[PDB]
Amino acid sequence: NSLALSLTADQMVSALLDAEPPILYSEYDPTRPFSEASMMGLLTNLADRELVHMINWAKRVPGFVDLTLHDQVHLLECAWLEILMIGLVWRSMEHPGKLLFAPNLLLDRNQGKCVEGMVEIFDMLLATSSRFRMMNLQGEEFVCLKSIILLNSGVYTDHIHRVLDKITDTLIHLMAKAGLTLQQQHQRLAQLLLILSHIRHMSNKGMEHLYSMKCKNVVPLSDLLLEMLDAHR
Amino acid sequence: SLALSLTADQMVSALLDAEPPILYSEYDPTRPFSEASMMGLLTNLADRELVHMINWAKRVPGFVDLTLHDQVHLLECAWLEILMIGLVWRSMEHPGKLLFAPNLLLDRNQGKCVMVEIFDMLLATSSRFRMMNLQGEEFVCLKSIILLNSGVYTFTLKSLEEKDHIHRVLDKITDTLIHLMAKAGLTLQQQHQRLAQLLLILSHIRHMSNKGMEHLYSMKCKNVVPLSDLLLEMLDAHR
Amino acid sequence: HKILHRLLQD
Amino acid sequence: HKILHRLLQD
Numbered sequence: 116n117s118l119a120l121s122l123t124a125d126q127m128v129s130a131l132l133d134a135e136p137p138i139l140y141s142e143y144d145p146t147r148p149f150s151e152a153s154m155m156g157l158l159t160n161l162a163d164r165e166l167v168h169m170i171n172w173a174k175r176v177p178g179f180v181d182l183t184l185h186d187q188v189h190l191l192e193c194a195w196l197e198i199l200m201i202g203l204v205w206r207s208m209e210h211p212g213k214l215l216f217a218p219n220l221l222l223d224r225n226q227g228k229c230v231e232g233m234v235e236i237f238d239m240l241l242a243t244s245s246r247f248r249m250m251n252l253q254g255e256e257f258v259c260l261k262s263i264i265l266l267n268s269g270v271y272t273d274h275i276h277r278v279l280d281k282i283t284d285t286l287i288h289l290m291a292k293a294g295l296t297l298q299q300q301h302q303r304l305a306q307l308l309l310i311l312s313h314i315r316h317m318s319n320k321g322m323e324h325l326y327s328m329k330c331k332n333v334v335p336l337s338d339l340l341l342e343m344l345d346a347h348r
Numbered sequence: 349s350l351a352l353s354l355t356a357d358q359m360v361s362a363l364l365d366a367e368p369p370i371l372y373s374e375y376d377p378t379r380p381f382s383e384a385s386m387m388g389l390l391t392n393l394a395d396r397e398l399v400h401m402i403n404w405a406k407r408v409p410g411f412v413d414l415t416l417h418d419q420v421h422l423l424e425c426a427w428l429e430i431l432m433i434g435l436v437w438r439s440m441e442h443p444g445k446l447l448f449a450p451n452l453l454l455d456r457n458q459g460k461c462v463m464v465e466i467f468d469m470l471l472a473t474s475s476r477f478r479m480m481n482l483q484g485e486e487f488v489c490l491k492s493i494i495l496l497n498s499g500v501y502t503f504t505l506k507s508l509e510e511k512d513h514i515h516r517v518l519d520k521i522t523d524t525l526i527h528l529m530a531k532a533g534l535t536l537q538q539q540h541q542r543l544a545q546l547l548l549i550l551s552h553i554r555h556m557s558n559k560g561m562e563h564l565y566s567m568k569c570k571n572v573v574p575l576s577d578l579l580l581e582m583l584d585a586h587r
Numbered sequence: 588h589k590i591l592h593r594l595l596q597d
Numbered sequence: 598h599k600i601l602h603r604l605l606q607d
């Protein structure tokens with residue numbers, strides 16, 4: 116009874132591409148953040164505005180609409196940080212060694228290593244970006260990956276499974292379209308999906324640090340961010 | 349080396365033979381046991397399993413090709429993930445229960461905390477494998493994937509060479525998983541879908557591990573549940 | 588009641 | 598050094 120499963124591969128790709136949220140900007144102040152207050156201030160600000168675009172993007176992901184409101188809330192609560200991060204590493208691809216949080220906000224590990232901030236997570240994101248770049252990740256593949264994260268991350272907590280299969284078909288469709296052999300297709304599929312385990316890892320680590328930021332209570336957090344963080348505690 | 353030259357069936361046989369034994373807990377029904385008692389059983393058990401895991405790891409095709417420092421890192425990152433998937437595997441035929449050991453079969457009820465959420469995630473995961481009819485051959489491939497993949501992005505140069513070798517081995521294991529599914533009479537589409545399904549599970553196992561490591565840290569701070577020197581060092585690396 | 592609940596309705 | 602390191606190299 117879900118329309119998602121009736122879509123074709125190209126239809127799914129188009130739906131997802133049309134769903135893509137815009138790339139948002141940070142403040143136009145040109146000072147490069149080296150403190151935690153300043154940097155974390157910019158990240159919370161950015162994440163807040165992105166969460167609104169993400170919420171409306173999610174509703175345009177095929178199959179998501181068919182879920183109960185409660186299931187939608189759960190999936191978003193589970194996957195919001197993963198979705199932001201994979202977006203980050205995506206737009207950071209063409210800037211090796213740097214993290215493009217926004218077009219006007221390009222950070223390096225010297226700002227990251229700069230308290231706390233966290234350099235470990237910073238480095239993880241960079242490695243992920245570099246890997247996406249070396250794989251020559253395509254935009255169409257990226258959108259499929261991001262939607263998988265949305266539907267899968269909170270799944271454990273048939274529709275979702277059947278929808279996830281459709282997205283799998285769509286990824287293979289894209290790879291076949293790119294001229295990849297059968298072996299290259301399933302190898303690239305595995306490579307991409309295994310990246311999701313690390314994205315999960317970074318999200319969990321990031322959530323622990325966001326939680327710390329909350330407790331330190333310096334750097335106020337929006338109600339939405341605290342509720343998204345609460346869901347994890 | 350050997351890992352790259354191995355056929356699919358050779359890879360499977362090698363992994364199946366490298367399988368660690370199923371250890372017993374020290375659970376005793378005649379004893380009271382708090383709920384830090386159950387955790388004591390599980391940490392004690394995990395500690396003993398770790399020696400056998402280290403053994404199993406060195407027999408994972410391509411693992412020995414790595415430097416001791418890389419092998420150490422991979423195990424520090426993946427040990428809890430590996431124990432958990434092992435748990436879920438042997439718990440398949442026990443719906444609603446987790447078989448930590450042949451003499452330690454638990455349902456979600458028995459105190460714990462609210463740890464229960466991790467318990468339920470393990471139950472759900474195990475439930476997933478059951479409906480997919482996960483095969484032992486597939487399982488051993490998945491477990492070796494965890495080992496080689498979990499810490500691969502948190503290890504410079506020539507250290508880059510180690511990474512590439514790991515990616516190749518992973519690629520080979522992917523080829524092996526497909527080989528198995530094809531053997532099972534699955535259509536290409538069904539092979540790709542099953543492959544994805546299996547790999548997505550690993551995301552949740554990573555999640556369960558992460559949550560587990562947090563509780564583990566808690567147990568250390570509380571200082572009631574005994575943790576082996578090895579478990580503490582393992583926990584040390586993660587933090 | 589959470590903000591997500593509201594925003595998901597819009 | 599590390600126990601894990603010791604257990605591995607033998």
Ligand SMILES: CC(C)=CCn1nc(-c2ccc(O)cc2O)c2cccc(C(F)(F)F)c21
Nearest residue numbers: 161162199200203232233236237321324325
């Ligand atoms: C320098 C590092 C590794 C910080 C981690 N991080 N990255 C983002 C983020 C914000 C917007 C976006 O579009 C994509 C993102 O990944 C983010 C948002 C809230 C908390 C944290 C944390 F984990 F620092 F608390 C975050």
Ligand SMILES: CC(C)=CCn1nc(-c2ccc(O)cc2O)c2cccc(C(F)(F)F)c21
Nearest residue numbers: 390391393394431432435466467560563564
């Ligand atoms: C009650 C629950 C589900 C706790 C999670 N958990 N499960 C195992 C474990 C031990 C042996 C084995 O063969 C397989 C396992 O998953 C384990 C080992 C150390 C710490 C924890 C911690 F801190 F997460 F509780 C562990």
